[PDB]
Design an enzyme around this catalytic site. Sequence first.
Site, PDB file in Angstrom:
ATOM      1  N   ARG A   1       1.054  -0.873  -0.062  1.00 31.76           N
ATOM      2  CA  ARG A   1       0.251  -0.271   0.012  1.00 31.76           C
ATOM      3  C   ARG A   1       0.695   1.427   0.303  1.00 31.76           C
ATOM      4  O   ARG A   1       1.342   1.672   0.732  1.00 31.76           O
ATOM      5  CB  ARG A   1      -0.825  -0.013   0.772  1.00 31.76           C
ATOM      6  CG  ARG A   1      -2.262   1.274   1.535  1.00 31.76           C
ATOM      7  CD  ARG A   1      -3.476   0.552   2.151  1.00 31.76           C
ATOM      8  NE  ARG A   1      -4.649   2.082   2.307  1.00 31.76           N
ATOM      9  CZ  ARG A   1      -4.814   2.806   2.900  1.00 31.76           C
ATOM     10  NH1 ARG A   1      -3.231   3.544   4.081  1.00 31.76           N
ATOM     11  NH2 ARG A   1      -5.471   3.896   2.947  1.00 31.76           N
TER      12      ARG A   1
ATOM     13  N   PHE B   1       1.603  10.623   1.229  1.00 35.19           N
ATOM     14  CA  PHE B   1       0.984  10.104   2.580  1.00 35.19           C
ATOM     15  C   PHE B   1       2.179   9.297   3.014  1.00 35.19           C
ATOM     16  O   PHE B   1       2.798   9.558   3.991  1.00 35.19           O
ATOM     17  CB  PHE B   1      -0.426   9.771   2.416  1.00 35.19           C
ATOM     18  CG  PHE B   1      -0.978   8.799   4.034  1.00 35.19           C
ATOM     19  CD1 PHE B   1      -0.451   9.501   5.034  1.00 35.19           C
ATOM     20  CD2 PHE B   1      -2.217   8.223   3.638  1.00 35.19           C
ATOM     21  CE1 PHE B   1      -1.056   8.821   6.493  1.00 35.19           C
ATOM     22  CE2 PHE B   1      -2.273   7.728   5.007  1.00 35.19           C
ATOM     23  CZ  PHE B   1      -2.476   8.255   5.770  1.00 35.19           C
TER      24      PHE B   1
ATOM     25  N   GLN C   1       3.272   1.650   2.368  1.00 31.72           N
ATOM     26  CA  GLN C   1       3.421   0.710   4.206  1.00 31.72           C
ATOM     27  C   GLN C   1       3.763  -0.942   3.242  1.00 31.72           C
ATOM     28  O   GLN C   1       3.504  -1.029   2.448  1.00 31.72           O
ATOM     29  CB  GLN C   1       1.744   0.502   3.935  1.00 31.72           C
ATOM     30  CG  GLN C   1       1.248  -0.057   5.725  1.00 31.72           C
ATOM     31  CD  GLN C   1       0.299  -0.628   5.805  1.00 31.72           C
ATOM     32  OE1 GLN C   1      -1.022   0.617   6.002  1.00 31.72           O
ATOM     33  NE2 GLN C   1      -0.350  -1.258   6.628  1.00 31.72           N
TER      34      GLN C   1
ATOM     35  N   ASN D   1      -1.674  -0.549  12.469  1.00 35.87           N
ATOM     36  CA  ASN D   1      -1.489  -1.382  14.086  1.00 35.87           C
ATOM     37  C   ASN D   1      -3.436  -1.757  13.711  1.00 35.87           C
ATOM     38  O   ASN D   1      -3.858  -0.497  13.036  1.00 35.87           O
ATOM     39  CB  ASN D   1      -1.783  -0.588  14.980  1.00 35.87           C
ATOM     40  CG  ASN D   1      -2.388   0.952  15.296  1.00 35.87           C
ATOM     41  OD1 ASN D   1      -3.001   0.915  15.038  1.00 35.87           O
ATOM     42  ND2 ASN D   1      -1.126   1.867  15.757  1.00 35.87           N
TER      43      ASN D   1
ATOM     44  N   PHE E   1       5.037   2.055   8.078  1.00 38.97           N
ATOM     45  CA  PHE E   1       4.711   3.063   6.919  1.00 38.97           C
ATOM     46  C   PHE E   1       5.970   3.422   7.513  1.00 38.97           C
ATOM     47  O   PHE E   1       6.591   3.857   8.686  1.00 38.97           O
ATOM     48  CB  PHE E   1       3.529   3.547   7.699  1.00 38.97           C
ATOM     49  CG  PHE E   1       3.040   4.021   8.292  1.00 38.97           C
ATOM     50  CD1 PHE E   1       2.538   3.405   9.260  1.00 38.97           C
ATOM     51  CD2 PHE E   1       3.439   5.107   8.426  1.00 38.97           C
ATOM     52  CE1 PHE E   1       2.419   4.074  10.867  1.00 38.97           C
ATOM     53  CE2 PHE E   1       2.730   6.111   9.348  1.00 38.97           C
ATOM     54  CZ  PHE E   1       1.757   5.961  10.508  1.00 38.97           C
TER      55      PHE E   1
ATOM     56  N   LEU F   1      -1.832  10.978  13.790  1.00 38.23           N
ATOM     57  CA  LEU F   1      -1.752  10.267  14.066  1.00 38.23           C
ATOM     58  C   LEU F   1      -0.566   9.158  15.501  1.00 38.23           C
ATOM     59  O   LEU F   1      -0.417   8.700  15.714  1.00 38.23           O
ATOM     60  CB  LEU F   1      -0.711   9.631  12.869  1.00 38.23           C
ATOM     61  CG  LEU F   1      -0.921   9.070  11.180  1.00 38.23           C
ATOM     62  CD1 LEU F   1       0.402   7.947  10.650  1.00 38.23           C
ATOM     63  CD2 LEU F   1      -2.041   8.755  11.748  1.00 38.23           C
TER      64      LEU F   1
ATOM     65  N   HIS G   1      -0.318   5.605  17.117  1.00 39.65           N
ATOM     66  CA  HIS G   1       0.338   5.043  16.024  1.00 39.65           C
ATOM     67  C   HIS G   1       2.344   5.120  17.358  1.00 39.65           C
ATOM     68  O   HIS G   1       2.877   6.216  17.094  1.00 39.65           O
ATOM     69  CB  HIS G   1       0.912   4.838  14.717  1.00 39.65           C
ATOM     70  CG  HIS G   1      -0.620   4.760  14.084  1.00 39.65           C
ATOM     71  ND1 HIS G   1      -0.306   3.664  13.548  1.00 39.65           N
ATOM     72  CD2 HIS G   1      -1.669   5.724  13.754  1.00 39.65           C
ATOM     73  CE1 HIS G   1      -2.144   3.460  12.832  1.00 39.65           C
ATOM     74  NE2 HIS G   1      -2.992   4.402  13.503  1.00 39.65           N
TER      75      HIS G   1
END
Length: 163
Positions: free
Chosen positions: A54, A59, A62, A101, A112, A121, A125
């Site tokens: 991904r 952004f 991942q 997660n 990521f 985040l 995270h």
Amino acid sequence: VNPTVFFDIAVDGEPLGRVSFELFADKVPKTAENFRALSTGEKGFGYKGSCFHRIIPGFMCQGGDFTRHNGTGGKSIYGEKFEDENFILKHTGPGILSMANAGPNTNGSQFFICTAKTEWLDGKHVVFGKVKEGMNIVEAMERFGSRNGKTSKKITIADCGQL
């Protein structure tokens, strides 16, 4: 004293380049150790050969799902899941390495690499490293992503380990 690990990235099997990461073992030792050990493969499993499944330009990239290759798998060196260690470090900009997660205290092997500041985040995270060398290679990877995250070519960790 903080460990450095590398990934050698391939695109459809063709070498792209090397990214190295500083892991903040001083701040988040348990989290850093999981990533380090998965990168050397010393426990008998890990990141070598796994894909980034991904990639969303602007952004993040991942990866780390070495069991199902699609975001539904992975496991840590401590078991299926492990706790959120602390939230000392924040998502301050491109190059930050943070755990993916599925809720509180569900960290596995997925992570990521941020390619933007992602402050929303923070506190959800666990940040545990940063890109040290090869941010340009991360930027090159980002070009194979898309808005929905699907990649246009297969991006793999062809080799990895500790420097």
